[PDB]
Amino acid sequence: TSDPIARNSDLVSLFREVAATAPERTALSAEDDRISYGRLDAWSDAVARTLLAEGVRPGDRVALRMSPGAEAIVAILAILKCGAAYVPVDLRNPVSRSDFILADSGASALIGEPHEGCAVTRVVRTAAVAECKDAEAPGPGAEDMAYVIYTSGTTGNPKGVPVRHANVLALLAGAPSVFDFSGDDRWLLFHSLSFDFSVWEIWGAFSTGAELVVLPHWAARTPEQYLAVIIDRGVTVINQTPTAFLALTEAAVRGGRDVSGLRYVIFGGEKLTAPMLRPWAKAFGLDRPRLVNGYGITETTVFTTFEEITEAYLAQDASIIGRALPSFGTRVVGDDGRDVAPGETGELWLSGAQLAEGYLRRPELTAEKFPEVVRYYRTGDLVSELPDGRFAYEGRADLQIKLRGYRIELSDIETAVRRHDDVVDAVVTVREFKPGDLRLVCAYVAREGSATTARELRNHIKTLLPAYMHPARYLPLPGLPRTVNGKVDRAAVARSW
Numbered sequence: 297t298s299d300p301i302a303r304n305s306d307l308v309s310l311f312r313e314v315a316a317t318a319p320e321r322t323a324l325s326a327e328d329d330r331i332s333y334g335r336l337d338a339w340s341d342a343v344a345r346t347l348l349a350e351g352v353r354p355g356d357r358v359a360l361r362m363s364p365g366a367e368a369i370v371a372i373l374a375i376l377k378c379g380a381a382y383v384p385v386d387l388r389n390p391v392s393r394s395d396f397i398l399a400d401s402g403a404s405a406l407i408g409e410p411h412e413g414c415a416v417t418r419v420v421r422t423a424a425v426a427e428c429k430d431a432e433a434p435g436p437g438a439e440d441m442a443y444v445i446y447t448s449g450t451t452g453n454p455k456g457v458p459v460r461h462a463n464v465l466a467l468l469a470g471a472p473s474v475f476d477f478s479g480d481d482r483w484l485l486f487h488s489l490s491f492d493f494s495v496w497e498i499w500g501a502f503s504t505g506a507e508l509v510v511l512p513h514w515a516a517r518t519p520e521q522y523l524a525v526i527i528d529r530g531v532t533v534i535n536q537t538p539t540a541f542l543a544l545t546e547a548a549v550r551g552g553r554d555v556s557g558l559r560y561v562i563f564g565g566e567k568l569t570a571p572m573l574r575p576w577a578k579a580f581g582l583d584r585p586r587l588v589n590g591y592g593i594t595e596t597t598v599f600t601t602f603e604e605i606t607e608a609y610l611a612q613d614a615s616i617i618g619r620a621l622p623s624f625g626t627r628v629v630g631d632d633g634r635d636v637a638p639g640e641t642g643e644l645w646l647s648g649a650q651l652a653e654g655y656l657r658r659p660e661l662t663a664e665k666f667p668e669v670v671r672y673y674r675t676g677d678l679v680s681e682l683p684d685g686r687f688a689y690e691g692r693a694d695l696q697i698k699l700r701g702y703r704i705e706l707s708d709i710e711t712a713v714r715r716h717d718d719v720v721d722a723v724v725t726v727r728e729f730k731p732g733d734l735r736l737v738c739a740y741v742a743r744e745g746s747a748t749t750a751r752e753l754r755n756h757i758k759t760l761l762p763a764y765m766h767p768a769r770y771l772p773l774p775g776l777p778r779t780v781n782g783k784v785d786r787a788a789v790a791r792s793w
């Protein structure tokens with residue numbers, strides 16, 4: 297085969313082949329500074345020698361604390377070329393999360409700038425990366441780790457997820473079943489290196505010989521700045537949370553921007569419902585760019601299913617995540633541990649080449665979350681199958697509560713609220729009204745240009761759910777408060793109430 301993706305079994309070999317084949321092509325750009333594949337390849341080789349001198353060796357985990365930028369990408373390639381895995385540290389982490397990630401992962405060095413109180417003292421500064429810029433071992437194998445990304449810590453300590461070269465290759469080999477990507481694309485490098493969206497941005501581009509456009513620091517703050525850069529730099533592929541897309545749409549329409557240079561907008565991270573999509577579709581259509589909903593998790597290498605948005609999508613009121621990539625086997629599993637009848641909701645279980653090998657130093661959790669039956673991963677997500685094989689995303693599987701004599705599926709209530717045409721987000725929790733008097737309440741976000749009242753939402757909910765599932769109060773917020781991992785800050789919602 298001529299295809300470098302099919303022919304290579306690790307990311308370093310893939311990169312080197314793509315670079316050597318056409319090394320003058322642009323791999324990465326920062327403003328007008330264009331770094332060719334050849335330049336990037338030599339630069340990262342020089343940085344790798346620097347890491348070898350700090351003792352980095354195959355199997356090491358090297359911390360990375362940098363903004364997404366050219367230096368950060370060189371540092372990733374350098375770490376990988378040493379046969380090591382990178383452990384990205386979000387610059388905005390609470391100090392305690394960064395402290396835990398570094399202790400947990402046993403990081404033996406850090407590239408970039410250490411956080412305040414950082415226990416890793418073996419450091420290669422950003423300046424030392426820049427110094428290698430224009431200079432002149434077997435490398436990793438399929439089964440070696442490429443990175444360790446940590447889950448958000450919703451349920452307990454952040455879980456460290458080691459992802460292998462073979463895992464990433466399997467995702468990259470699967471992408472062309474949904475996407476038409478080529479070497480002429482320009483991908484915006486946007487997300488924190490600590491998010492696995494970043495992994496997709498980087499390798500989506502490198503695996504096809506495409507260019508990674510770096511979002512400049514000056515443009516990091518507003519969607520107007522964001523649009524200005526993507527349009528000016530000829531970006532063709534962007535990756536967004538549905539929430540970011542709301543603000544993007546609003547800035548594009550109001551600013552009269554031309555978005556039609558984009559070929560794909562790819563969503564991940566959150567439910568995507570039609571009220572979030574209809575205004576873009578109204579202004580711009582669904583062809584240029586194509587919009588593609590994506591569902592995935594760190595444990596199964598970034599993305600699992602995709603659904604390209606169509607007119608039909610806009611005409612229904614659920615979040616449809618679509619069909620699994622070709623590497624995956626799937627089950628939808630009841631509470632008794634057995635499959636469910638097609639059409640009914642159960643826990644999504646996943647099998648295949650994209651599954652990680654388990655958590656880092658968590659034998660107990662790994663046995664639980666990665667059962668043999670064929671090895672599976674339990675997502676902790678509820679889904680239901682459509683009569684095509686497409687999945688609808690229902691909610692998290694751990695949101696059943698006991699209240700006032702009922703078991704209550706909060707995810708069901710959230711889903712019912714999100715069916716409303718003028719709602720774009722919602723979270724249902726329990727709060728105290730009078731001592732010993734706890735009730736369901738719902739904080740929600742109205743779509744731009746609307747103002748749905750508590751009375752109207754109550755009226756909508758009573759057509760869908762039994763009275764024991766009715767939120768007792770509604771609270772309109774300008775947006776839901778979020779954590780650094782973007783997970784909705786439930787301490788903050790409490791305070792809002």
Ligand SMILES: Nc1ncnc2c1ncn2[C@@H]1O[C@H](COP(=O)(O)OP(=O)(O)OP(=O)(O)O)[C@@H](O)[C@H]1O
Pocket residue numbers: 447448449450451452453454455563564565566567568590591592593594617675676677689691692781783
């Ligand atoms: N496209 C999507 N639609 C809806 N929800 C999503 C989507 N993508 C991710 N999520 C939610 O985010 C979760 C991934 O978050 P993360 O890896 O931080 O795990 P967590 O459960 O939040 O944290 P922890 O596992 O540490 O308790 C998914 O299981 C899913 O519930």
